[PDB]
Amino acid sequence: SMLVVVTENVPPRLRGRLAIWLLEVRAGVYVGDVSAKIREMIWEQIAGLAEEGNVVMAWATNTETGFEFQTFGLNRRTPVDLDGLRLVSFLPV
Amino acid sequence: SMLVVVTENVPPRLRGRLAIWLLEVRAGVYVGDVSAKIREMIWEQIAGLAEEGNVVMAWATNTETGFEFQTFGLNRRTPVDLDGLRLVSFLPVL
Amino acid sequence: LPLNPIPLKDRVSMIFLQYGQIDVIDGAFVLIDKTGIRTHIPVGSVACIMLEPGTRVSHAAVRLAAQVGTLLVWVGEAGVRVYASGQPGGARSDKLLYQAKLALDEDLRLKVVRKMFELRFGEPAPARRSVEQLRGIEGSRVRATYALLAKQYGVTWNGRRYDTINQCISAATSCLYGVTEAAILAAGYAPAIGFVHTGKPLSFVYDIADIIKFDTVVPKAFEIARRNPGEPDREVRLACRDIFRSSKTLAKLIPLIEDVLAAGEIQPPAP
Amino acid sequence: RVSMIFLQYGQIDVIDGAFVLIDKTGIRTHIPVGSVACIMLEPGTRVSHAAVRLAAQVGTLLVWVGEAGVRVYASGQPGGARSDKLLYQAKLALDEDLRLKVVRKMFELRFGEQLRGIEGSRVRATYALLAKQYGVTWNGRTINQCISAATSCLYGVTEAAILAAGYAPAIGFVHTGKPLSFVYDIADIIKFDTVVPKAFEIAREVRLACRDIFRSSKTLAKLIPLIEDVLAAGEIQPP
Amino acid sequence: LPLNPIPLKDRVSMIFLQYGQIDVIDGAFVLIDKTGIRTHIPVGSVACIMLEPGTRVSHAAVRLAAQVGTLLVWVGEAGVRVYASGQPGGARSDKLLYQAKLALDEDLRLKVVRKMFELRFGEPAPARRSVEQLRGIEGSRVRATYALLAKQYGVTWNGRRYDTINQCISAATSCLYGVTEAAILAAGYAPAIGFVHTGKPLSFVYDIADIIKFDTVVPKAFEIARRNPGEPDREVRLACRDIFRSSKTLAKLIPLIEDVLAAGEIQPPAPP
Amino acid sequence: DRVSMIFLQYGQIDVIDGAFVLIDKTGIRTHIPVGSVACIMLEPGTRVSHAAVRLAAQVGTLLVWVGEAGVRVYASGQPGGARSDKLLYQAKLALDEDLRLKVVRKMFELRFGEPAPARRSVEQLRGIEGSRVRATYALLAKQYGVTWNGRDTINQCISAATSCLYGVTEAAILAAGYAPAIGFVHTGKPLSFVYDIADIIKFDTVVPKAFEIARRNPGEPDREVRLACRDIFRSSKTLAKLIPLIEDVLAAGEIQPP
């Protein structure tokens, strides 16, 4: 499944590891086609090595909306479900 | 086909329009499943409305690499091809 | 750079909003929870947004929805249409007057109605019938098909009301009626100007939707009615969204409207 | 009923079957929703499901507009609620013989095919006299911006009236083939009565001034019957 | 968090690099153009990176590849293996000694070689044959299939010399030998300790790859040689990469290795 | 028949006029006796041309990528082992219980300086060495006047020192053609055979230099310790003695070596 990871202000360690498995099409944007197992290992790496940072991971799925995403870090938006549709929720500014 | 658009330092006009058709999963990151025509229109909006801002658009494809991308704006990296594999090339930062 | 509505086929057919307020904040179409949470809805990528009682809509939202060509539908019990808002009228006079001449001239009217018959029933109508006469034939066939479906799903049938089954049918066709109004407006025609149904609020909607109504949507109303689940409405709506996607309903709606109108053999407006 | 009202900067809801508006200040004002033909909602208005339901029940059109009605963004019952009215208008436009009668009525109201040129000349002169009065240097069509600003506001409310009356904005008689041809047809009739003179006096200030025109002269209540009078010239029995 | 190599099956089979210098800069595995252009290769998601003459490798590059479980292979003319680098030796002594016992005991050796024969040819070898005898039978069968394929693709055959057809065949099998050396290392065994081929640097590689060699890879060598295209090496390499993807070669190689060895009927090491 | 091991750092490796050379940042070009050596240890900041890697292969010189002064082994040329004869030789010795004791006994003999007690168990022998090493640390602390609490700054200098020995010992084992994971005294770790060998020579030069360095109490000790171990490796024939020590240890099996 196509996988995209977008990082903001994460340690060099995380950046270096994403670049081991994914193509860095812009600094802090990583794209690849990986299996679900690989994807989950990549999420582990994100939760472990991102600290002050914001991360979002999105991947293609066979669902009504056709993709799924999960976020990490401060001010992360939250993935929500509306009658089977994937949407996003966030805090008032 | 899944579509991801990542914007950096682009005008509010572009952001507002991306938000018309795509889900904003983070500020400046837009995701959707759209047809090639819709994708091609959204790139037009990007080429038209990004001003010195940096944009990258990536989408899922039926190729060896499984995705495709094109970039726009300042300091953009360039999609390159290595024996049918999609890779990225860029200039060294000073 | 101009903002152009994407084709209805390239969108999610419909979204029902149960609670909250609809608004635009920092240039994003947004549903606001009573707690204050913001949920982003990519408005341009949906064909129909339904508003159940207990929803508030802002000026900026109606404005944006209209500009991206997304119909807003206020709904009530069984999802019945209460109201809708969008761009006021069709921008092209040639399209309206074209539809209007077809509907006013009784010979042209019949030519149109015959095509509707042919499309609905897979065979030509009996020759030399008036529009009124054809509606009788159509009526009998429908009641027949209503009955036949009841036998195939084990649902008790006492007729159609216009009753778990009767609630399901209305819900199912209300969903079809919604995206059909959406399709009629997107094509530039008047929902109010019809050929079979007349003087009614959305005559042309009923005209178009009733043609494809029984293919999948109404049979689905029975499959769910046989089940007799606690909340029939939410289940039917989800099913219609499924049907519309797999049947490619929205993409099939545009040429259906033109063909029905083209049957008058008056020259159509240019693309 | 032919009355049209504006509503701005408020929340709409129904209490005890009563249509009401809540100011940014908590003070709440009641609205005679039944009496009016149309309600024009200006930016900053929020409408409850109940309010929209009630408006539908009583048959008052909801039209979302710009400040003082500069532009029309959206209308309730898009494409037209009332088919009897649309077909009535459409019928008149399809018969050229019936069409002239409406065109003629328009010219008859304009001055208390050859005519189109004559009106153009008549208008050119009406601009010249008004220029003399306000002592404005004139070159034909800042004054020009003030006139554009002035008519634009008139255009907006005229569209809303046409919608509220149940007609098609795009089907014009003198002016044709533009999305707002019928709006031009109607607004042109009354543009010089009040709106265009006010433009010269000024030459945003114009918009606020046009707002005062609509409020004071109750021109809004005069719009729908004018539309009806113009379309009655077909001599075809109205709905 | 520890850095764990991703499964070989979950990678691009191989990448050939013709020019430039391969390096790690700003934390990214990178090919560097003579002009200074940087190409990012996600090193961890490819199983084999081949280095054609005129490539320089930096310390940081050799290091990172080894850490992410990506074999680096120096290739020369016809893409023949010149050198390789990776994690030094098998981390597990139990796996190493298991293979070694199988190879050292002459009885066990034979049992394994018989399994190799059965897998390669779809039927048991004649009973009571030695390894030397079994290789002759195998050799004989192979020469037949070489000839038989030449007849089926209309390729002139003067025999096999370890000349478009021979260059294509060697190129094809070098691609298979490369990803097989990678699979053996990934499984924790010694590429050097073989059963049929012996005393040679990659004996176990030749043993394993020759079992599955003729299924698709070598036939493809003939299909390409009849065409006689301008760039034969490049055409073969792309075709092999295609074969590997669709046949799921990398996913099949680890359990193939395990089965070949298990035929000794001594107990295999426990998995993690 | 060659046992020399050399370091290369901060340079580009290439062959000019078919001669093995390293070129510096300054540009100075120095020839390297690649044929003569058993192994070449490449330190961070080295770049190798395709030609150099080919030539190293042709002459049978192992290339091992290591950390500074040999702290770590990152990668080896011919991964998994180049020489099957040497690998199997070791493997046989570890598989036959009698051959295994013969090698273990030889290992303790070298550790003790005299043959091990024939009437004493392997487990018992492991224990005797344990008291001896604990004492040897104390002996060294006492000799150099270093404050000692067992196995501080002293402990860091020792860790730094042993690491360079371990790293270089692994390079020796690989160059000899053996598997680091196949050990005799130490077992069940990836570097067991490395430990076995290094433990034998640990205390001759490398661990004493640690105590000698710790006398200073410096702020940045590791660089001082590594540079010191390097000076030992460069100045003393410690590198040239590793492989023959390894081979001598395996000869105790008494089976004919390759």
Side-chain angles (χ1 to χ4, degrees), chain C residues 58-76 78:
Chain C
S58 80
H59 188 275
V62 170
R63 171 165 86 241
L64 185 57
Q67 288 173 5
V68 293
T70 298
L71 184 65
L72 299 184
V73 181
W74 285 261
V75 300

Side-chain angles (χ1 to χ4, degrees), chain C residues 14 19 42 56 122 141 145 179 184 248:
Chain C
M14 36 176 204
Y19 297 120
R56 294 186 156 263
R141 289 226 196 185
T145 313
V179 298
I184 288 169
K248 297 174 177 268

Side-chain angles (χ1 to χ4, degrees), chain F residues 6-9 11 13-15 18-22 27 30 33-46 48-57 59-96 98-104 106-118 121-122 125 127-133 135-148 150-151 153-155 157-214 218-219 221:
Chain F
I6 63 168
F7 280 100
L8 286 182
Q9 63 172 1
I13 323 293
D14 203 331
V15 345
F20 206 105
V21 344
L22 178 157
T30 111
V34 71
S36 168
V37 296
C39 172
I40 289 183
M41 294 172 287
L42 301 172
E43 304 192 78
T46 42
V48 283
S49 84
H50 188 288
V53 168
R54 185 201 288 278
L55 176 62
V59 299
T61 293
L62 188 60
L63 300 186
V64 180
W65 287 258
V66 292
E68 187 196 278
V71 174
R72 207 157 315 110
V73 172
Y74 291 109
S76 175
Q78 322 283 49
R83 308 155 70 183
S84 62
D85 56 343
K86 289 291 202 82
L87 240 160
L88 285 169
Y89 174 46
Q90 175 188 11
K92 186 181 175 179
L93 291 172
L95 283 173
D96 183 277
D98 291 339
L99 288 194
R100 167 177 283 272
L101 304 155
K102 278 179 200 180
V103 177
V104 166
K106 175 86 190 183
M107 281 185 177
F108 281 114
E109 180 175 329
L110 279 170
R111 279 175 193 230
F112 294 160
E114 71 204 62
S121 75
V122 165
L125 281 183
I128 294 178
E129 172 68 12
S131 62
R132 285 189 89 254
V133 52
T136 303
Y137 277 127
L139 192 48
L140 289 174
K142 131 180 310 186
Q143 167 170 12
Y144 290 81
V146 160
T147 172
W148 189 243
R151 165 137 252 275
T153 273
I154 181 54
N155 260 333
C157 279
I158 291 167
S159 296
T162 62
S163 281
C164 292
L165 177 69
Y166 284 174
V168 170
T169 304
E170 177 172 353
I173 291 169
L174 296 170
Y178 297 112
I182 295 172
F184 299 80
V185 178
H186 207 288
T187 66
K189 297 314 251 159
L191 298 176
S192 285
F193 192 50
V194 168
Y195 303 158
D196 277 6
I197 296 294
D199 280 358
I200 297 166
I201 71 175
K202 209 203 298 192
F203 287 107
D204 291 338
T205 35
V206 161
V207 179
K209 205 84 193 183
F211 278 96
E212 172 170 329
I213 267 55

Side-chain angles (χ1 to χ4, degrees), chain C residues 83, chain D residues 2-7 19 31-41 54-56 58-63 82 160-161 164-165 220-221 224-225:
Chain C
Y83 212 65
Chain D
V2 301
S3 230
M4 297 197 326
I5 67 167
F6 284 97
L7 286 182
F19 201 98
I31 295 97
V33 71
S35 169
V36 345
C38 170
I39 294 182
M40 295 170 287
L41 302 172
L54 175 61
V58 303
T60 295
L61 186 58
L62 299 185
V63 178
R82 308 149 69 185
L220 305 188
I224 294 192

Side-chain angles (χ1 to χ4, degrees), chain A:
Chain A
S1 182
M2 186 188 174
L3 183 64
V4 178
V5 181
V6 179
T7 63
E8 195 189 73
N9 184 207
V10 300
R13 169 145 301 156
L14 183 49
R15 301 267 316 268
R17 286 196 168 185
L18 290 173
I20 286 171
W21 306 295
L22 303 182
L23 194 65
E24 202 185 10
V25 294
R26 182 217 81 191
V29 178
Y30 302 89
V31 186
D33 194 352
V34 297
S35 74
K37 181 255 129 184
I38 298 285
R39 172 167 73 255
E40 292 170 348
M41 94 84 75
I42 290 184
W43 183 252
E44 284 177 29
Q45 301 278 325
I46 289 159
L49 308 181
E51 21 215 23
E52 70 284 26
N54 178 312
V55 181
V56 58
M57 169 191 272
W59 61 97
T61 69
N62 238 272
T63 62
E64 178 111 311
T65 303
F67 69 94
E68 197 68 61
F69 74 107
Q70 191 48 261
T71 65
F72 179 87
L74 80 174
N75 287 126
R76 53 178 286 279
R77 301 188 164 196
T78 43
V80 195
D81 179 276
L82 179 55
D83 288 331
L85 296 169
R86 194 63 55 249
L87 289 185
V88 73
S89 286
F90 51 99
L91 297 190
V93 156

Side-chain angles (χ1 to χ4, degrees), chain C residues 21 51-60 62-63 66-67 71 74-76 80-93 96-101 103-104 181 185 189-194 198-199 201-203, chain D residues 12-13 41-45 47-50 52-53 55-56 60-66 72-83 86-87 89-91 93-94 99 159 163 168-172 176-180:
Chain C
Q21 158 157 324
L51 312 167
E52 290 179 9
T55 27
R56 294 186 156 263
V57 55
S58 80
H59 188 275
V62 170
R63 171 165 86 241
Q67 288 173 5
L71 184 65
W74 285 261
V75 300
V80 62
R81 182 180 182 286
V82 170
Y83 212 65
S85 69
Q87 245 183 54
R92 290 176 52 165
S93 65
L96 295 183
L97 289 172
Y98 168 68
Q99 175 184 12
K101 189 182 181 41
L104 284 177
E181 183 179 347
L185 293 167
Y189 296 99
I193 299 175
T198 52
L202 302 111
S203 292
Chain D
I12 317 241
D13 207 330
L41 302 172
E42 303 193 11
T45 332
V47 203
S48 83
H49 188 289
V52 168
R53 187 198 288 278
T60 295
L61 186 58
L62 299 185
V63 178
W64 288 255
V65 293
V72 177
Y73 293 115
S75 173
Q77 322 286 52
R82 308 149 69 185
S83 62
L86 239 96
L87 289 170
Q89 175 187 10
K91 182 183 173 180
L94 285 173
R99 173 178 287 274
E159 177 177 353
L163 297 170
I171 297 172
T176 64
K178 305 318 249 161
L180 297 176

